[PDB]
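quick one, nine chains, predict together pls
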Amino acid sequence: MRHRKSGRQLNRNSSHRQAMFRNMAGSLVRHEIIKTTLPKAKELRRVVEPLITLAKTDSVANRRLAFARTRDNEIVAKLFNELGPRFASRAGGYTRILKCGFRAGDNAPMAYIELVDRSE
Amino acid sequence: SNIIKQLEQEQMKQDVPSFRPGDTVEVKVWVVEGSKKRLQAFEGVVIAIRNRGLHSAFTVRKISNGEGVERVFQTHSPVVDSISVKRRGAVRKAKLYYLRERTGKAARIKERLN
Amino acid sequence: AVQQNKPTRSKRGMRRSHDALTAVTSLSVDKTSGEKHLRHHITADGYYRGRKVIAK
Amino acid sequence: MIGLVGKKVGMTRIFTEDGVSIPVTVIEVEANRVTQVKDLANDGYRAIQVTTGAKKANRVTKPEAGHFAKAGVEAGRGLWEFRLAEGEEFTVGQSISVELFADVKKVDVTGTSKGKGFAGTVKRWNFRTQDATHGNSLSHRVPGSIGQNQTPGKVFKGKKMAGQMGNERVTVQSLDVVRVDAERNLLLVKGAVPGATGSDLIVKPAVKA
Amino acid sequence: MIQEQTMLNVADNSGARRVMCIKVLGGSHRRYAGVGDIIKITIKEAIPRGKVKKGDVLKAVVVRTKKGVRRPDGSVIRFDGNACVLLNNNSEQPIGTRIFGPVTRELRSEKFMKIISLAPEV
RNA sequence: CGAUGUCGGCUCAUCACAUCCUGGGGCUGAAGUAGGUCCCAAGGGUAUGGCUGUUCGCCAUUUAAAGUGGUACGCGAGCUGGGUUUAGAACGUCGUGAGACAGUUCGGUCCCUAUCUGCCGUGGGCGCUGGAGAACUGAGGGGGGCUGCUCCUAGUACGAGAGGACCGGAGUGGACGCAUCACUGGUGUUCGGGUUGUCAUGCCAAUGGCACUGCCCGGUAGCUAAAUGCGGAAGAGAUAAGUGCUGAAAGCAUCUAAGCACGAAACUUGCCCCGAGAUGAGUUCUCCCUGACCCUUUAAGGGUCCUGAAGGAACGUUGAAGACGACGACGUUGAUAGGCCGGGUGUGUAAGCGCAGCGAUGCGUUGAGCUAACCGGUACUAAUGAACCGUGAGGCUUAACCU
RNA sequence: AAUUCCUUGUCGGGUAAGUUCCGACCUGCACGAAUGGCGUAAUGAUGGCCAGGCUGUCUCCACCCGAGACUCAGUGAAAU
RNA sequence: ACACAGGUGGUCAGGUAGAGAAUACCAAGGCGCUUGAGAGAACUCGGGUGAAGGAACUAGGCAAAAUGGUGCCGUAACUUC
RNA sequence: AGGACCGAACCGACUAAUGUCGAAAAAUUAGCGGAUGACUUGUGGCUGGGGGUGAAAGGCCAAUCAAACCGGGAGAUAGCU
């Protein structure tokens, strides 16, 4: 009956589900802003926020866990050199989500999600 | 819940002599023999420890006349007089449930000297 | 499983009485740009809450 | 003789001196203050309308805050009534505490149960599940027959079928109090009260004896 | 939790070795029994000479269930397997002298004092 | 006969009383115990297996009892398809034969997305007549109602003795229902670890993907039962059989015709839930609106400008709430989620390095490292100023009190 | 008995209890010798029965993982 | 009848593990199957695990669970050996 | 050596569930039987309607079989609806 649970199934199985947020994390960090639907954005907060949390602690132990998720060294190199020291003061949320429109081909609620520094 | 966390620690006993799963625990129970309140002792090996505050409990097995006899014990209960650790086991697991299958020679365990 | 008498034109419309559509009720005007957008939604230009934050 | 509304915090254990592990429920009962005293000739029957809690300034409404300013009380969260039992008057503003729940043995608990959702017949009315093998096709947990035949020609009103389960005001009767900390304004009672871990429930003295 | 068709080991030395609970006694539609109540058993496997032969309907009373029973402190005492002690069909009083293994204090009330005295412990 | 699917089982029932049990009574060839028979009584309860296709029956063993019947011999647009009752085959048997046989014997497709009625749930519209927010009273309807055993009164009442109570009280179980997660366990493909084969990250190392979560071992929260609490009631009103009182008709007698009183798990309440759509739409408390103009077949009318309140809805963060709506919490004056800090809890000595060992690998740092929904805090992110809907004192008649 | 109506025949074994099953009595309604009789090792996706093992078949179901169902967007039937 | 979970003869057929063209993961090479975005109800379909009991279910152990590999040791009634 | 055993391809179709206006006018999923033979299969021939062929079921002969389909007798005949 789903009392007190967490996570969002997204009409997708578990192996597929954890392969999405792993892949979606690499897309979020690389371009600093992505366009996706609301429940995918609302759950992406539960993935990359623990990631940037471990990205402001430079150590070989933490780099291995930062690579155990997202499985990409370039995203690991994009962290710990920029996103770590750009966020080593703010002890909170590292992203904001804005409702943009509706995915035209199927009427899906889309939402812009970006990283809160955007200084370039 | 601090309202519950208050009420949890006015009943937890203070000593709780630290043991680990794999140890050989001697535990004495306040059994009531009708009129008398004699103090009998239970002996054996801890299989599991369920470490959760006031509800912290542990399971001691006992090979007795061949048949294994297990018994869980609420740590902060008044019926448990004391917990005496005889041997220090050096198992890897946290719950030793596979010991319910084995008997005798294979049920022995190494020493935790280090 | 299957019907027995043809439902009328009156019963067809009465079933579609609850099938009306609520539209737009009240839009919102952004602080800076003055462009219309949905409540808690960015403008089609790109403003949000008096701030061109997506920078298209 | 009058009920007291309080918030369920949770359930826990209490060890007695002999060793009995009495499972209790921790019901916090804050300041229950009177907001209205209804009388026979003035308002029909007689009861007291009691409230408790702390509601924010910009959430309490004008017809609500004006009702409290008449009573001279503080705006709690919601308000309930309890029937007076043959002769008792306090005031409009009597902040009743858990003090009177220290000499009454058994009490009654009325609270809302946990909503199980749209739950089936096997879950709701304990209908025995059909055979899961031996040829059975698409009818493992279906209710089966729900009426006789052409002679009654209908389904009897009150037939136990599937629907909404729980989420309803339920009352467990005659639970025993075990301890009251009037310094902390608590209520410890024997057993289990209706659910919704941090919601409210009405505690009233024994209607059964 | 001894319901029915349950292969029970024996505790005493009545000649039985392996029995089966065919009916829990006391109460209509009763599903199973605990450590304190009696059942009706048949003899599935018996000692050659013994005191009872294979295929006899007698009453037993279980002493060690694998589910275990619960003392009022929350503690449960589980066993390795199911076991019972036989007793006469009419004037109960257990048929046997020696009783193997431990028993449980939830047998102690004016009739099973004959059992718990002959038991080694508890 | 341009189709009403056949026995039995399963699931789910429901009604009748000619009553199996529990309840209250009369008679006895009723001492007691135990029974027998009969009247009133339908509130609830009313087997498990072996054999059989079987209903039934027989048997074993329980139970307070294992009731008797109606409802297409209840129930296939709910399931089963063993029987019977298609096409194959065989035995005995009747017939020259094709074949036939409640004569047996092996095998043998069971369809339907529910429009309407009914029923279990949940909303919308509008109404209730000035509008809105809460709270309720209670017409009426439903749920629930069963009971064994031990002890006590009591080895007392009765009785030569043997045996052995009624009544009332308490403890403790079975079946049933309700609530709950403290505990006992289960589960936990979102958590930690072990491990086989292979691929990949350049390689060692360390991890990841796939193989049903690959197979596994444990296991937070949430959901639950086997787990743990609780409930059936007492009392009262009106009676049924039956027992009476007083009492004439009929100077007597008499429970009945006047009048009155006891009398059951049945009837009405008492307990719990829904409940003012109860159009007979009730009551209480609180808040809100007291600007000007014309027209008119001048009527509770239409329209103009100006203001739209309390509040509601919407939108968004979301819930131990939920199919969807609804309902509950909150929206910067903020703790409603997420993230974060700390803790708890689970897994059980991470990585890297140092030393020992030919090596695998073992110790030290290290009860470490990592920790899903849980607990207590913290505005770091998202809950944006508005806008939309809702108005401008509320008809006529009569009484009643003061102008 | 693939044959036995009466019939679940009767006795013995298995089970707590066995219209089925196994071994036998002949009382063969209505077996019988190439429309073969009686046995037979092996074989059989064959018929009946029993025991161990193993388990959600069942006592009595519980939680979880996915595909529909449910909601919004597009397209859009059918029996009757 | 269709851009149809069906049918259609032959040829080539690599790496690791493996008895193997089984099977598991991959190379060359080719596809994500022409509706999807949410919710996480009853109930249906395919599966995973399960306390104690272990055929008590049922027409019937049907279905599931279970066993399962190699070498060595060991192996009955009966028999056409 | 073998109408020998275990078991893929290939051929077949015992069991169960799904499906039953299907994904399919007999299939899919999970197990199952033959798998050096009376085996299986591609291509091309020959046998035809009271006739063929039949390890024989009244089975098969173009989704049709106790007498195929097509056209013609023929608007058969219908004491029936």
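Chains C and B do not touch (no CB pair under 8 Å).
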